[PDB]
Amino acid sequence: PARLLIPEPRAGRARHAACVLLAVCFVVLFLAPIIRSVCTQLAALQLGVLLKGCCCLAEEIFHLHSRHHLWQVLCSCFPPRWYLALLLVGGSAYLTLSCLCQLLVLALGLQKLSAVEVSELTESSKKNVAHGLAWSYYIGYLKVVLPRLKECMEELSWKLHILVPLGCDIWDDLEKADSNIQYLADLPYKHSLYVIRLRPCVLEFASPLQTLCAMSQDDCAAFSREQRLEQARLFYRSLRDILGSSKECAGLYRLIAYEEFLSGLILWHLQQQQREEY
Amino acid sequence: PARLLIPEPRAGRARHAACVLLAVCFVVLFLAPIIRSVCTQLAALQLGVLLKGCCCLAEEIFHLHSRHHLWQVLCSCFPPRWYLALLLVGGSAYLTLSCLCQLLVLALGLQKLSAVEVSELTESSKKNVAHGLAWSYYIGYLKVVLPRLKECMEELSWKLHILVPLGCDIWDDLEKADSNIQYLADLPYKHSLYVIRLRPCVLEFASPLQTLCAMSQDDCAAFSREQRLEQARLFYRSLRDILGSSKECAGLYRLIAYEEFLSGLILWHLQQQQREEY
Structure with missing residues (x-):
């Protein structure tokens, strides 16, 4: 067939080799101040x-x-x-x-730092979930959805809004969490046009934070809430740095990040976008 | 509103501070062998x-x-x-x-190593995509699909097979790449029962390698093929280490990893599973 050639974790024998070299040089130099x-x-x-x-x-x-x-x-x-x-x-x-x-x-x-030390620090830490999550959310979802959205907007006749909560609860629906949000319609991949009491908007959560909501409450592997916060901050930083250098997505989005009503923040972002249009 | 408090990248002023301290101590001690x-x-x-x-x-x-x-x-x-x-x-x-x-x-x-050095190495490298991709593929897909699959198998009356290609081309369909593969049916989330000339199987690719297929050929950000291979090996290692400690997924899967026909490897894995049943 084809035998697999994957690397294995480090056994940690350099420390014992240094210990043996120390004992040899110690005995040779031994043979008070x-x-x-x-x-x-x-x-x-x-x-x-x-x-x-x-x-x-x-x-x-x-x-x-x-x-x-x-x-x-x-x-x-x-x-x-x-x-x-x-x-x-x-x-x-x-x-x-x-x-x-x-x-x-x-x-x-x-x-x-040598290459082996850098590779050891890469293979060691499993708490680097943010970069992979940001690249998965950029490639698998945004690069396909975002160019067609202005065409869907012209077919319905703004830009997409991504919620970035740095908290924990994502299952709060936007009609259920915020009171002034009223659902309007879809765009033929859910896309829920909303109106806040009184402006229209295109709003969506960021999905993979639910991933960070599932690595905590399930607890099949060890994870903590301060780690959830640090990873969410790193995820927002990585998504911001990617989409700032996004070629075709330069004017189709605006990230909104917050912590813990909620609709006034959306009003402030819409007012800032309206003033930026002027 | 709520002002955002995100960390920023390091400006790199510790090196200049050490330089100033060196110049001060140099002038004080200056004031040949x-x-x-x-x-x-x-x-x-x-x-x-x-x-x-x-x-x-x-x-x-x-x-x-x-x-x-x-x-x-x-x-x-x-x-x-x-x-x-x-x-x-x-x-x-x-x-x-x-x-x-x-x-x-x-x-x-x-x-x-201090905490600031570890955090600097975490925020520095963007080539840690494998851990985030493995956790996204575990939580978002496998933990929901895998428990219902034995129920779907009993409703149709084995275990799921995940292809892990460490190469590049994923778009090779299993009826198109391998000749002996014949499609049979679905299970009501595509699940394509196959038969290889002459054994039945439940086969699926691993999705997020296409992510690694898209970070290379698009080339909006820098990436190389040796990095694709190293990241794919790390992804297979991380998925293996996770699913080896998977609580409910202990006997519903078998990872198959290869490099570069193809159906004989699947026959060898099926024969090894059949012998492991004995």
Whole structure:
């Protein structure tokens, strides 16, 4: 037949190989004050973690109220091995040239990550659902529906509106959630023309958030609600970045993102589109 | 209304902040042989890249014929700044304790990546389409179709077969690509009972590979065919890992993966399932 050739997960034998190499070099060099030199060199390498944490703090200043709400900044900047660095610094002291060396290392950009590390981080994390969901929602639905919609609009004689809720409940129907929404008609693939008490609109939810609604409440695999929020924000970011560079879909859509009535937001978007027409 | 609070891409100001800190410490310490000490310390830090490359080679031994086909191993193990390390080693020499120190660093596992670096690698790469595609194909299609299929099979009086082609062409119809396939009937969401010259089967393609067929030939955004192959392999891996832990779908399916007649593979899978029934 044809035998399948798929890659497998990493067994993790580089760590044991480094351990064996360490034991061999340790026995060869073994065959009393040198451990002081070893520990001082070790603190000299570990001080770069502290300088990297300072630089990470300097970048993560701007996103306190938007991404970290103060403890979440300091918890996320340096790695959680916090008790190692200052302890080894105190063991070495009781130099500044080493700090200058670490700055020269980190500023130039010679710590390129290798291909195996990048591939390991790709195959490791399963929490990258947003990019695949955005590309599936763009290709499978939007690129076919969107060019025909202006033709359907001329046959009925605006642009499509996509709801992006960053919450959880999607099954709230638009006539059921919002009171002022009244259904009008279809366009021959559901397309529900609505009127809000008093403007007409073409409104639809974004489907794959229900996917994110199903990865949480079913709980056959592990997932959390803060992860749902982060993935929904990343999905909106990816769909915005794709459709901003959309070739044929330049003026057929307008994304509407919100969190938690509801119809006044739609009125503000319609008023902003009307003013943008002027 | 409600102002949106979405994160933005990183401006990249930590590098300039490290540069300013370097210039300040450089001016303060400035106010002739010390640069030899600096360069020797720099080679002492850069030797860990060489040891890390040796460990990466030791792990990437096992995947030559399966992932790298010999130059692709050595190109992928160490970072592409190869001319830096040996040159600085030669500039420092013309010690082994530093090698022992680097081994003690890399074996214990104190180089934890921070949260900001992990988030930067998540938001950076757009080539993680496989996990989102697999979860969309599992939730949106399989979890609803698969429990009703045995009821439809009893109403017609086996299990569903999913084709996973790792090639490119999906539009080859099963009566058109394979000659021995004959259509029989449906099951009231297309479900085409087939007979291969001479066994019956329930066969269907996997849909979202056409998504990967559309991200390549349209070419509105950049994508390559080797990336199509790697993403298809990752998609098959993710779908296999999900459906192996599928709760209700434990005996309703069998994935079939291949590359490039075609019907003999289906005969071998049916014969293996028949022998597994015995």
